[PDB]
C-alpha cells in the first residue's frame, strides 16, 4: 500500500494514525488571504513528494536530537535553490520518521513539534544563540556533551530542560505523538504552516523544528545494539513569489 499523489513514493506507509492537530487540514493557500496577484511563475505540481534523508547513528544512551524546518532541507531536491532566490515563502510538512523494529528488543520514543528556541549561550553579558547552530543542515545537532567551537556562543545541550526553557513531558502541548513498538512501528504526524506572518525568510528565520526525545532508551543484551532511523519528509503547499537568476 502507498499514498497516491506523485510518481515517486515510499514503502511502509501502513495506516495513518495521529491525533488531530486542532482540526486543521494542510490548506492550499488561495487568493483570499493574500494580496492582488503575487504569482509570477507557478512551481512544479509534482513537487509534493517524499525525500529520504541519510540515516543517523543510534547511541546506547540516547539523549535526543532535533532538526529545524525548512533548514534541514536546503540542498535537497530541485526546490533547494528555488526558495533561496525566491524572496519569502510558506510550506507545510508530512513527517514520516521511524526505524526498523522486531518483537524482541525494547525502545520507546516521543515525537513533538515546537517552532521556538530560547537557550542560554553566554555568561551575564548579552546572550545570543549561534548562527551555525541554528543552521546545521541534514546532519542536525549530534547531541553529545562536548566542547564545540571553544568557549563562545553555545546553546546548552539538555533534553529535560527542552532547550527553549520548558519542563520535560509537558512539552507535549503542541501536536504530539507517542511511538511504542507493539502498537506502532512507524510515525506519521500532520503538520501545517502556523505563523504570525504569511511569508517569512528561510535563510535566517526558522518556520518549524522537529523534537526528538526518547523516554525509554535502547537497552538490549544481544549481538547488535544499533538501529538507524529513516527520515522521510514530504513538503506541502510549495508556493513562492520572486523571480531571480539561477547562477550568482
Amino acid at each position: 500500500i502507498q499514498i497516491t499523489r506523485g510518481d515517486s513514493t515510499i514503502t511502509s506507509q501502513d495506516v495513518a494514525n495521529a491525533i488531530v492537530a486542532y482540526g486543521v487540514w494542510p490548506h492550499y493557500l488561495s487568493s483570499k488571504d493574500a494580496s492582488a496577484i503575487d504569482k509570477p511563475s507557478q512551481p512544479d505540481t509534482s513537487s509534493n513528494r517524499f525525500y529520504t534523508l541519510r540515516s543517523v547513528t543510534w547511541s546506547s544512551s540516547s539523549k535526543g536530537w532535533w532538526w529545524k524546518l525548512p533548514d534541514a532541507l536546503k540542498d535537497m531536491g530541485i526546490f533547494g535553490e528555488n526558495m533561496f532566490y525566491h524572496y519569502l515563502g510558506r510550506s507545510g510538512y508530512t513527517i514520516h520518521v521511524q526505524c526498523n523494529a522486531s518483537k524482541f528488543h525494547q525502545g520507546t520514543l516521543i515525537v513533538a513539534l515546537i517552532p521556538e528556541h530560547q537557550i542560554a549561550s553566554a555568561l551575564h553579558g548579552n546572550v545570543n544563540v549561534g548562527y551555525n547552530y541554528t543552521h546545521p543542515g541534514e546532519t542536525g545537532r549530534e547531541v553529545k556533551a562536548e566542547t564545540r567551537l571553544n568557549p563562545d556562543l553555545q546553546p546548552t545541550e539538555e533534553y529535560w530542560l527542552n532547550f527553549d526553557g520548558t519542563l520535560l513531558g509537558n512539552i507535549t502541548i503542541f501536536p504530539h505523538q507517542f511511538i511504542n513498538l507493539r502498537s506502532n512501528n512507524s510515525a506519521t504526524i500532520i503538520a501545517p504552516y502556523v505563523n504570525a506572518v504569511p511569508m517569512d525568510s528561510m535563510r535566517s528565520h526558522n518556520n518549524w523544528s522537529l523534537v526528538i526525545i526518547p523516554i525509554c532508551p535502547l537497552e538490549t543484551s544481544s549481538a547488535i545494539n544499533t538501529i538507524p532511523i529513516t527520515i522521510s519528509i514530504s513538503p506541502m503547499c510549495a508556493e513562492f513569489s520572486g523571480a531571480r537568476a539561477k547562477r550568482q
Partner: protein, 222 residues
C-alpha cells in the same frame, strides 16, 4: 463556564515599570526625564502569562498613577506632561524639539483636582499578531530578543516649570490591562528565574541547578 477564559487570565491591572523622576537642585537645561522603552516581558508575575503563548492579539490599556509628596515650601501644585510617541518614529531627548510640540503625537495632561489618568490604546503590532518570541533573525544578523516588528512606541514624562523648581519625588507607576483578548497556541511554563529582558537563562551568575520542583525522598510515603 464563562469566567474560565484568557480574558480573565490576562485581564488584571498589574504594574509593569517603576518610573521614578527626581528633581535636581540645579540644571543647565531641561534634562529631567525617565528613560524607558516599551516592554511586555518585565516582571515574573506578568511574564509567565506571556511565556504560556507563542503569539497574542489584544489591545492594551494603560493607567498612570503619579505620586505627589511635599518637602519644602509646599511644593506640589504643578502640571506635568505625559506624551506617547507612535512606534517606528524617532524620539528626541530635550525640552522642545520636533516631537514634544507636534500635532502627530498623542498628548495628555494631568493635574490634582480631576480623576486619575486612564486611557485606551489601539493596535500596536505591524503584523496580525504581537511578537512574544522572535525565532531566528530578521533583516539583521546578530540581534535577538527585541525586533523592529515588535514595536509599541515610547513613554516619557517631561517637566514644564522653568525657574520655580524644587526637589520633589514624582513616582509615576504604570499599570497594564488587557482588552479584546484573542490568543492561540499554548506553551509550557518556565522552570527557572529571569535575569534579562526577552531572555530565559540557565547558566548565569554561577548558580546551582536548583529548579522550582520540590523533591520527595521515597515517593512511597508522601
Amino acid at each position: 463556564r464563562d469566567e474560565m477564559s484568557l480574558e480573565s487570565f490576562l485581564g488584571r491591572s498589574g504594574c509593569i515599570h517603576e518610573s521614578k523622576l527626581e528633581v535636581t537642585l540645579a540644571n543647565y537645561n531641561k534634562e529631567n526625564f525617565t528613560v524607558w522603552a516599551i516592554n511586555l516581558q518585565e516582571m515574573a508575575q506578568i511574564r509567565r502569562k506571556f511565556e504560556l503563548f507563542t503569539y497574542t492579539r489584544f489591545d492594551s490599556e494603560i493607567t498612570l498613577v503619579p505620586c505627589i509628596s511635599a518637602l519644602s515650601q509646599d511644593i506640589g501644585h504643578i502640571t506635568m506632561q505625559y506624551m506617547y510617541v507612535p512606534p517606528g518614529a524617532p524620539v528626541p531627548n530635550s525640552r522642545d524639539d520636533y516631537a514634544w510640540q507636534s500635532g502627530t503625537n498623542a498628548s495628555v495632561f494631568w493635574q490634582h483636582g480631576q480623576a486619575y489618568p486612564r486611557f485606551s490604546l489601539p493596535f500596536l503590532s505591524v503584523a496580525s499578531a504581537y511578537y512574544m518570541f522572535y525565532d531566528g533573525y530578521d533583516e539583521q544578523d546578530q540581534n535577538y530578543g527585541t525586533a523592529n516588528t515588535n514595536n509599541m512606541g515610547s513613554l516619557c514624562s517631561r517637566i514644564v516649570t522653568e525657574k520655580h523648581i524644587h526637589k520633589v519625588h514624582i513616582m509615576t507607576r504604570i499599570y497594564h490591562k488587557a482588552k479584546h483578548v484573542k490568543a492561540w497556541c499554548p506553551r509550557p511554563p518556565r522552570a527557572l528565574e529571569y535575569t534579562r529582558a526577552h531572555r530565559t537563562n540557565f547558566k548565569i551568575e554561577d548558580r546551582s541547578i536548583q529548579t522550582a520542583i520540590v523533591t520527595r525522598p521515597i515517593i512511597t510515603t508522601a
